[PDB]
Amino acid sequence: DRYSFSLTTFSPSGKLGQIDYALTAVKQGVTSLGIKATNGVVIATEKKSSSPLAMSETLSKVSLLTPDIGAVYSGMGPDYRVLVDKSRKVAHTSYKRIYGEYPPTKLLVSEVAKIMQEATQSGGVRPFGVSLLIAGHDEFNGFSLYQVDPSGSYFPWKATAIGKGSVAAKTFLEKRWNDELELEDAIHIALLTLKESVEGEFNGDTIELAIIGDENPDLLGYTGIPTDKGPRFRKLTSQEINDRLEAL
Amino acid sequence: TSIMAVTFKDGVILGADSRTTTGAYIANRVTDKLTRVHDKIWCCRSGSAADTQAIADIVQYHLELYTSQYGTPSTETAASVFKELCYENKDNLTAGIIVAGYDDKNKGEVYTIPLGGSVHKLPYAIAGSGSTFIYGYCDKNFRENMSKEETVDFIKHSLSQAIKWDGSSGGVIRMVVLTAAGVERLIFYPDEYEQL
Amino acid sequence: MDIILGIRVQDSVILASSKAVTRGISVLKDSDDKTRQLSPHTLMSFAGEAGDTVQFAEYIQANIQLYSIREDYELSPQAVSSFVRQELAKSIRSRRPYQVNVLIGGYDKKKNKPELYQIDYLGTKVELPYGAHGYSGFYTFSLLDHHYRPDMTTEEGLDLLKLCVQELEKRMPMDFKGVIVKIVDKDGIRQVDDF
Amino acid sequence: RNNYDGDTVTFSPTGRLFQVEYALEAIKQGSVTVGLRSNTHAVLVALKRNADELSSYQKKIIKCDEHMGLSLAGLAPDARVLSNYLRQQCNYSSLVFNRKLAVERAGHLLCDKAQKNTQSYGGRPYGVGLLIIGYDKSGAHLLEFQPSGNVTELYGTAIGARSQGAKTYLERTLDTFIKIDGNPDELIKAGVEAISQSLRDESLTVDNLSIAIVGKDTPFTIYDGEAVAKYI
Amino acid sequence: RYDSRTTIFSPEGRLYQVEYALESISHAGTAIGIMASDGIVLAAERKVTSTLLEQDTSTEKLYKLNDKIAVAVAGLTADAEILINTARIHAQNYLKTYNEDIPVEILVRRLSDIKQGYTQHGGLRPFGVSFIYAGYDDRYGYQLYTSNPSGNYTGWKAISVGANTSAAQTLLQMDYKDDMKVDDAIELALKTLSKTTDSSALTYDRLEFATIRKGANDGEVYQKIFKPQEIKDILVKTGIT
Amino acid sequence: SDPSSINGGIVVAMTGKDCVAIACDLRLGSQSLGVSNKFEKIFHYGHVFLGITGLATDVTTLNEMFRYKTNLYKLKEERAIEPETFTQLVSSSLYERRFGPYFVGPVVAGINSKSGKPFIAGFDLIGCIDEAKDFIVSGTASDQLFGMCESLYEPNLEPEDLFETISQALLNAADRDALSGWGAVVYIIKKDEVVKRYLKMRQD
Amino acid sequence: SAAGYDRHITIFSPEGRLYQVEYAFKATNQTNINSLAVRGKDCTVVISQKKVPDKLLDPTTVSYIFCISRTIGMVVNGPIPDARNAALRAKAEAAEFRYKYGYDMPCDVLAKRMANLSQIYTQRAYMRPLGVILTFVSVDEELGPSIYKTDPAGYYVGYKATATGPKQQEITTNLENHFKKSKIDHINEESWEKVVEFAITHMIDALGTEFSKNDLEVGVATKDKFFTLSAENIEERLVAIAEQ
Amino acid sequence: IGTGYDLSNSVFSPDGRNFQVEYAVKAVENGTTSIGIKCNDGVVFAVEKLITSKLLVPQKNVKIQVVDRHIGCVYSGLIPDGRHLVNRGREEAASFKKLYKTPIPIPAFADRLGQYVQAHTLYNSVRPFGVSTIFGGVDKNGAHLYMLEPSGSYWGYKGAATGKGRQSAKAELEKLVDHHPEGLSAREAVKQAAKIIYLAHEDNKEKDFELEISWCSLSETNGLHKFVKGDLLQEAIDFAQKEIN
Amino acid sequence: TTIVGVKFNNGVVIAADTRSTQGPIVADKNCAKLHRISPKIWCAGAGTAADTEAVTQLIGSNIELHSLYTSREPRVVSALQMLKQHLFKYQGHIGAYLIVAGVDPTGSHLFSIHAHGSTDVGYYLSLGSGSLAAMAVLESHWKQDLTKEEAIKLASDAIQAGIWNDLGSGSNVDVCVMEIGKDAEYLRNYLTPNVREEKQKSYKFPRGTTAVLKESIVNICDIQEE
Structure with a gap:
């Protein structure tokens, strides 16, 4: 009641009403999920066209924050875009002068968290409508995956999911997850889990699935340097998703 | 280096020398000194390349915004805009601008803004450190309301004389003819111009 | 003009400071206090630039007293000496300077050793048991260390200091109008007369 | 409803605000003053109030300038902020332009200042009426300033408690005092008659009269005691 | 009701807001720091868990703020992040300024002023967090304190916060041996953690632990957050596993 | 010239083969007056060693400055700061002030643990990337040392070979400089072992 | 529900959403205007209705197609106050962008920065969302013909073609049939004039209502330019349809 | 509500x-x-x-x-x-x-x-405006007439009207579109303005009015705005009274 | 240092020597002097070394955001136009003297920048200390319309000629070719005119030829507690 007409006071059972509503706002979104393996990380989402005429191919819901780190969301569409904007800016500032190349995954998550936290702090501000997943790859902690909550807390995970179909996806991932998976194997889990959510439209035109694995000097835009590391992030096209989607 | 614009009966023809000089060394001999700020209105740059390049850019975005909100700009309008930048930064910046444009309602216009600036209407203006020599030439041999061809030939001979008495004038003589036939650049080789 | 002297003996730190203050061609008084106690067991002698010594001395004294009082136990000579140095290091990068050289001679109770530090006008904290600044250190870097016996007592250091002073008057055209010698020990801080 | 009895930033269904309306109330509980003017003079006559007979009575005339001046009827706190402002503008005109500020021109500055507080949600809105006199290049003028900010040029007007009888004196005798010019004596007497009728269950006394006069020949002067027991 | 701004007071002469922050602790995990002369242990319990949760290569309720002082968390985690970062910044100011490590009493004291400041000033929340501070300074040796969500500190030799504080406290003070040992701290903590927690078999992936010692590798203080397999060793001694 | 020239002092770091040496003099002087015969110019944040030359204030002040930033880096990420990454940092941090620029010439040296490769880097007042796999020398006797180190360097050396090369280098170059010398100390980072060998040399 | 919720955009509902933003998606029915944007192969077309309902209003002051900058048109649907506010910021930012970055501001990038702008108005309770729908049309130099629609929420998504208004649906369904059967997302003809004929025909069937020259206003975006058509030019295209 | x-x-x-x-x-x-x-x-x-x-x-x-x-x-x-x-x-x-x-x-x-x-x-701490504003003049493009709403909506007009007696005005303005499809010339429109306000004053009748007219005209006020006063205004007054009768 | 940028009808190639000269002392024999703005925009520095390095990272980050925003290959006008307004503000108090070269889907472009900044749009340019040396080669060995192989022989000659005449240049020539819509192939040590002369003597000694007052052992590896 008054514990989300105001942000000052709390429920006597803990937490603001605003946070529990912010999670409701997450589930009203598309379904996004990530699975970590020991030689890769898959990140996968669906995109609701929401008009036969809408082009969701022109805006994808998998967006590189920096070349080695992509992110997805589940939750409100407008809220995602500004939040992504601030991710690209802070990243250069915070570590592309400290290390002169793009940050650790781990670092950018602690930064993002402070921003989400500050909108839970005071009245006359609202939480963000999303929970994000940030996946990336660095050499200092290896492959990682994270879930970043609009409460202002963040949790690392091996595989997790969020969105409308989260509760179905989570039990599914528990069963099929093993101690060593391949990148290819984790893509083959990722398609099945998301297909539980939406069926009767599943194709790689409507489902976007992409990976964080090894460097691409092909998406780097240069070669001829013995130390160069191209984007750990990589987009599969519509055609490549179909090759994996047949493989099931 | 020398710049001029002379009105005629159907337009305005900008004339300028292309050599840009830092000390006695020529930086580049093909700098375009005639720079678009708007569709029908262009400015001439003389003096310091750096100061005149920056002051044109500021005015360029401003006159774009003027066209969208406040309707089509005039040469008159443009010239004042350059005045405000020139007056406050009369000690920071040294900016020579001849502000030439074409209206279908006011024909070609030539306005000249000193270093300090001030908006002054002239049948022709001439500015720079190569302008000093060619003044007397252009004073006598200004015919008013002369043909398109007569303008281009006049300018060509005047600037030839500027090149003979300054080595920072020279290169190719570039021209922007703002008329109702479009935007036509012209270029004149030293082979053509010097015999003349 | 304006000298500050320092010797570390193995049970006390002995700071000396001139009683003379000259503004213009005029000696204003032949008795001038030019050393202040930061806390009851740590003493700052100070010398330096015209009237900066006064503003800076009272500013530094007040801060150390606040932190001693705040903690509810007086801070080490080690804590004290970085702080003073850090004020100076900010000031030369600020739009207003203070250029005041100082010595901190405390008795450290924390580990039981006397501690003489040399803090520069520049703002450089270095530990030295014979430190000295301005034009004093041109004569007493060498005088202290020639006669210096590797162990020392309060008795030994005082006769050697008196001697140092006796050289300075002779080879500078200056007048220090003697020097007051305040002795920093485990029993607090005291004034004792000297040449 | 009267959900608008709290909001000064939110229109009431009538198109008013209630706050502006209550501000007119404040004037009614306020102390009476009668204005009137002619081409060559303008006069303010105001009633001093007291709470007892050991009170030495409230100044109802504030000298704004030596040629302009005002009187009040309503909130004295609000009257102070606007008096400060008003002197600041008249001195400004004498400093920069060596100029007298016109009665009418002053009034348009005060207008923006009322409506600023209406627009805002911060600080009190006004609740005092000022009767303003001056004598400029365009002769004597009389404005009625309202706490709304509406400024009205009349030949005579009144604000304060029981001010509807001053308007009735003034209406009848409207023309008598247009014809009188150059006689300060006559114009002063006319306000005094005026404010006897205005009042009810009261009588005038010597030290209840404060008459403030400026014209073309008369400097800005305030008459008290023996200088106003000649027109009672 | 009083709920609108923190610039008000309830009739107990406190604020209802402070009570609401109090309650935030008692729906989070349980936290225990036991001090001994020979080292201080910090312990926290995880309030989420899964088998696809990464918690074997990470901690989340244990931060070192400098290499001589560590903290445990009980409360919401969203509240925690902001104030940890500020305590750590204050430590490195101390290090920069005085050329030495901060005292325990100040570092906590600052943090306590800051919590109270959000009560004192504005309509901004109180931050419902209780932190256990286990530190070293060469003035009062080992020091164990905790900080209130109201924003005051009180010294200790053992304390529990989190969920079921009362239940935990009686159990800790019963088995407190008066010289104490770091090995007994470590042993006591697991036992006490078990009974509050709603699992009957406490486990190392469900555990966060740091032990602080200067009593071995003397003349210097070394603080160690334990690795998962070591936590397993100490569990086997208490007979839980 | 600059203030860096008035106070002086030298820090020289060098590379051999899976090793580094970074060594310094013990002279601090403030102009003509010699101040300390024992102020070490070598400091460290983990395995990364920071030398500092220049004015005496900035030797102490910047040390506090870079300590502050490496301590937040260390705690958050739970690893040691790397010499590869510290070179980035030194150059931006000094560049923060440009209108009050710090008057120093640092030397960074360390060995990366994520490959074991040896790293040395050179800087000036506001610092720039200067990459070497040979040597970086700094100070008022830097012009002497640049040649002295090149002359004695033989590419590809043992941890024990590298001692000899940096010692003979420092020994004569410091001595035949006004504002340098007065003792020296040599740190040989073998890989992760650091042995400290004090040079017996004269008092300058 | 209602207990705070609808009265704010900084108070979430039990659904996690904002009722108040969603009520502006019901503000396009009040002005009663419809748009149609279609892309040809080299062009983009926008046609919106023009409402002159009184003889005390000139046809040339009532327009809803605005020149934002040289190559960029925009159609506005919905209320006249929020129409202006959006228009200003789009002109100020487009002009500013163009010389700062030296690039002609693409359809995606204008639609993007504005959608960002609309999100910022919603997070603070001091500001409010825009009510209008802006459908930006440009022929880009990096993507050729494009339509990006930005919603009063701060959603923006691309479209083959898009429609807006109270009778928006009926046009949508007509465009669905057209692109689906042909298996191309463009109007096949290459001349911008003949594309405008096709687009005018789809609308007259779909709404059921024949239009006039002073019941349309048409902007046509071509390769690096925009221009808005006058009524007699629009008439020429209308009668093009009427007599084969 | x-x-x-x-x-x-x-x-x-x-x-x-x-x-x-x-x-x-x-x-x-x-x-x-x-x-x-x-x-x-x-x-x-x-x-x-x-x-x-x-x-x-x-x-x-x-x-x-x-x-x-x-x-x-x-x-x-x-x-x-x-x-x-x-x-x-x-x-x-x-x-x-x-x-x-x-x-x-x-x-x-x-x-x-x-x-x-x-x-x-845009701000809950700022009360809107509650005024319409009729405006216009002569410029580069000639004469233009506008009106602005307190909504913050505006459009151009041939004849505009606002206030209490606006019900009459609107009607007289319409008679004018038909009568003159030039909207009337500026000289004869000063007299047209007076007659309009008189029919509008029949909706305020219980009271008297004062009529002020101003104008700005291209070559009959010379590109400048000036107040209609003097013998000009009295002619406007006489036309109005005559045709109302 | 000789810097040359040479446009051609398939791309651009920019080249420079690898040798850092700060005053009369050679600062580094090899160093990368090609600075990255963006992955197809490479540029080289003149004037102050610290200032050209420092600026290219800040700017280049803003062009990188813009490269994601537009979802396109990065544009040279955007890079140049940001340097051009930026350098102006401090009025030469921070200088940076650069040949900017890059490629775009609108074509290939070539620029120069000053301390204050102004545009100069060339077909072939050279800047730095070795501007006067390079120029005569670029002018006179120039054919109307160049291609890839041609553009680089003219460019390399101009560096090798300025290696002879200038003494601010020398060592190995580092090269970067950027061809429109095709990867940027970085050819470091393309042309090596650097000959070398070896020492005639050894300079390694057995120990005890240096003297050791005392030794000490410091750690850089942390302690345990177990």
Whole structure:
């Protein structure tokens, strides 16, 4: 009641009403999920066209924050875009002068968290409508995956999911997850889990699935340097998703 | 280096020398000194390349915004805009601008803004450190309301004389003819111009 | 003009400071206090630039007293000496300077050793048991260390200091109008007369 | 409803605000003053109030300038902020332009200042009426300033408690005092008659009269005691 | 009701807001720091868990703020992040300024002023967090304190916060041996953690632990957050596993 | 010239083969007056060693400055700061002030643990990337040392070979400089072992 | 529900959403205007209705197609106050962008920065969302013909073609049939004039209502330019349809 | 009503309007009739300033106020509130003159005034405006007539009207489209303006009025705005009285 | 240092020597002097070394955001136009003297920048200390319309000629070719005119030829507690 007409006071059972509503706002979104393996990380989402005429191919819901780190969301569409904007800016500032190349995954998550936290702090501000997943790859902690909550807390995970179909996806991932998976194997889990959510439209035109694995000097835009590391992030096209989607 | 614009009966023809000089060394001999700020209105740059390049850019975005909100700009309008930048930064910046444009309602216009600036209407203006020599030439041999061809030939001979008495004038003589036939650049080789 | 002297003996730190203050061609008084106690067991002698010594001395004294009082136990000579140095290091990068050289001679109770530090006008904290600044250190870097016996007592250091002073008057055209010698020990801080 | 009895930033269904309306109330509980003017003079006559007979009575005339001046009827706190402002503008005109500020021109500055507080949600809105006199290049003028900010040029007007009888004196005798010019004596007497009728269950006394006069020949002067027991 | 701004007071002469922050602790995990002369242990319990949760290569309720002082968390985690970062910044100011490590009493004291400041000033929340501070300074040796969500500190030799504080406290003070040992701290903590927690078999992936010692590798203080397999060793001694 | 020239002092770091040496003099002087015969110019944040030359204030002040930033880096990420990454940092941090620029010439040296490769880097007042796999020398006797180190360097050396090369280098170059010398100390980072060998040399 | 919720955009509902933003998606029915944007192969077309309902209003002051900058048109649907506010910021930012970055501001990038702008108005309770729908049309130099629609929420998504208004649906369904059967997302003809004929025909069937020259206003975006058509030019295209 | 929706200006109704903006329009209605008539060579503005008592001084209180020397504006609704929009308007006018060394075009002014009204609805701590403003003049493109709503909506007009007696005015304006498809020439429109306000004063009848007319005309006021006063105004008065009878 | 940028009808190639000269002392024999703005925009520095390095990272980050925003290959006008307004503000108090070269889907472009900054749009340019040396080669060995192989022989000659005549240049020539819509192939050590002369003597000694007052052992590896 008054514990989300105001942000000052709390429920006597803990937490603001605003946070529990912010999670409701997450589930009203598309379904996004990530699975970590020991030689890769898959990140996968669906995109609701929401008009036969809408082009969701022109805006994808998998967006590189920096070349080695992509992110997805589940939750409100407008809220995602500004939040992504601030991710690209802070990243250069915070570590592309400290290390002169793009940050650790781990670092950018602690930064993002402070921003989400500050909108839970005071009245006359609202939480963000999303929970994000940030996946990336660095050499200092290896492959990682994270879930970043609009409460202002963040949790690392091996595989997790969020969105409308989260509760179905989570039990599914528990069963099929093993101690060593391949990148290819984790893509083959990722398609099945998301297909539980939406069926009767599943194709790689409507489902976007992409990976964080090894460097691409092909998406780097240069070669001829013995130390160069191209984007750990990589987009599969519509055609490549179909090759994996047949493989099931 | 020398710049001029002379009105005629159907337009305005900008004339300028292309050599840009830092000390006695020529930086580049093909700098375009005639720079678009708007569709029908262009400015001439003389003096310091750096100061005149920056002051044109500021005015360029401003006159774009003027066209969208406040309707089509005039040469008159443009010239004042350059005045405000020139007056406050009369000690920071040294900016020579001849502000030439074409209206279908006011024909070609030539306005000249000193270093300090001030908006002054002239049948022709001439500015720079190569302008000093060619003044007397252009004073006598200004015919008013002369043909398109007569303008281009006049300018060509005047600037030839500027090149003979300054080595920072020279290169190719570039021209922007703002008329109702479009935007036509012209270029004149030293082979053509010097015999003349 | 304006000298500050320092010797570390193995049970006390002995700071000396001139009683003379000259503004213009005029000696204003032949008795001038030019050393202040930061806390009851740590003493700052100070010398330096015209009237900066006064503003800076009272500013530094007040801060150390606040932190001693705040903690509810007086801070080490080690804590004290970085702080003073850090004020100076900010000031030369600020739009207003203070250029005041100082010595901190405390008795450290924390580990039981006397501690003489040399803090520069520049703002450089270095530990030295014979430190000295301005034009004093041109004569007493060498005088202290020639006669210096590797162990020392309060008795030994005082006769050697008196001697140092006796050289300075002779080879500078200056007048220090003697020097007051305040002795920093485990029993607090005291004034004792000297040449 | 009267959900608008709290909001000064939110229109009431009538198109008013209630706050502006209550501000007119404040004037009614306020102390009476009668204005009137002619081409060559303008006069303010105001009633001093007291709470007892050991009170030495409230100044109802504030000298704004030596040629302009005002009187009040309503909130004295609000009257102070606007008096400060008003002197600041008249001195400004004498400093920069060596100029007298016109009665009418002053009034348009005060207008923006009322409506600023209406627009805002911060600080009190006004609740005092000022009767303003001056004598400029365009002769004597009389404005009625309202706490709304509406400024009205009349030949005579009144604000304060029981001010509807001053308007009735003034209406009848409207023309008598247009014809009188150059006689300060006559114009002063006319306000005094005026404010006897205005009042009810009261009588005038010597030290209840404060008459403030400026014209073309008369400097800005305030008459008290023996200088106003000649027109009672 | 009083709920609108923190610039008000309830009739107990406190604020209802402070009570609401109090309650935030008692729906989070349980936290225990036991001090001994020979080292201080910090312990926290995880309030989420899964088998696809990464918690074997990470901690989340244990931060070192400098290499001589560590903290445990009980409360919401969203509240925690902001104030940890500020305590750590204050430590490195101390290090920069005085050329030495901060005292325990100040570092906590600052943090306590800051919590109270959000009560004192504005309509901004109180931050419902209780932190256990286990530190070293060469003035009062080992020091164990905790900080209130109201924003005051009180010294200790053992304390529990989190969920079921009362239940935990009686159990800790019963088995407190008066010289104490770091090995007994470590042993006591697991036992006490078990009974509050709603699992009957406490486990190392469900555990966060740091032990602080200067009593071995003397003349210097070394603080160690334990690795998962070591936590397993100490569990086997208490007979839980 | 600059203030860096008035106070002086030298820090020289060098590379051999899976090793580094970074060594310094013990002279601090403030102009003509010699101040300390024992102020070490070598400091460290983990395995990364920071030398500092220049004015005496900035030797102490910047040390506090870079300590502050490496301590937040260390705690958050739970690893040691790397010499590869510290070179980035030194150059931006000094560049923060440009209108009050710090008057120093640092030397960074360390060995990366994520490959074991040896790293040395050179800087000036506001610092720039200067990459070497040979040597970086700094100070008022830097012009002497640049040649002295090149002359004695033989590419590809043992941890024990590298001692000899940096010692003979420092020994004569410091001595035949006004504002340098007065003792020296040599740190040989073998890989992760650091042995400290004090040079017996004269008092300058 | 209602207990705070609808009265704010900084108070979430039990659904996690904002009722108040969603009520502006019901503000396009009040002005009663419809748009149609279609892309040809080299062009983009926008046609919106023009409402002159009184003889005390000139046809040339009532327009809803605005020149934002040289190559960029925009159609506005919905209320006249929020129409202006959006228009200003789009002109100020487009002009500013163009010389700062030296690039002609693409359809995606204008639609993007504005959608960002609309999100910022919603997070603070001091500001409010825009009510209008802006459908930006440009022929880009990096993507050729494009339509990006930005919603009063701060959603923006691309479209083959898009429609807006109270009778928006009926046009949508007509465009669905057209692109689906042909298996191309463009109007096949290459001349911008003949594309405008096709687009005018789809609308007259779909709404059921024949239009006039002073019941349309048409902007046509071509390769690096925009221009808005006058009524007699629009008439020429209308009668093009009427007599084969 | 309740449930927001008028209780703040940020909050929006499910209908597509704002009921707080509707009460502001009611305040324009309550105010005294103003008309503006566009012409093929000028603009004429007229206003009804009613006389409530004869204590007022005639030709001294008006709602006609000038901006530069060639843009006339006249306001209805809350009297000091219309003054203020003109006072800020005047500030906006000056800025443009200084920077571009040119007189302001009327559609340029038209953009700039409506941005002030709109700013006063984006904030719950700023009360909107509650005034309509008839405006126009002669510029580069000739004569133009506009009117601005307290919504923050504006459009161009051939004949415009606002206030209490606006029901008559609207009708006379329409008779004019038919009578003259040039909207009437500027000279004969000063007389047309007076007659209009007289039929409008039949809706205010219980009281007397004072009529002020001003104009700005291309070559019959010479590009400049000046007040219609003198023998000019009295001729306008005589025409009105005659044809009403 | 000789810097040359040479446009051609398939791309651009920019080249420079690898040798850092700060005053009369050679600062580094090899160093990368090609600075990255963006992955197809490479540029080389003149004037102050610290200032050209420092600026290219800040700017280049803003062009990188813009490269994601537009979802396109990065544009040279955007890079140049940001340097051009930026350098102006401090009025030469921070200088940076650069040949900017890059490629775009609108074509290939070539620029120069000053301390204050102004545009110069060339077909072939050279800047730095070795501007006067390079120029005569670029002018006179120039054919109307160049291709890839041609553009680089003219460019390399100009560096090798300025290696002879200038003494601010020398060592190995580092090269970067950027061809429109095709990867940027970085050819470091393309042309090596650097000959070398070896020492005639050894300079390594057995220990005890240096003297050791005392030794000490410091750690850089942390302690345990177990």
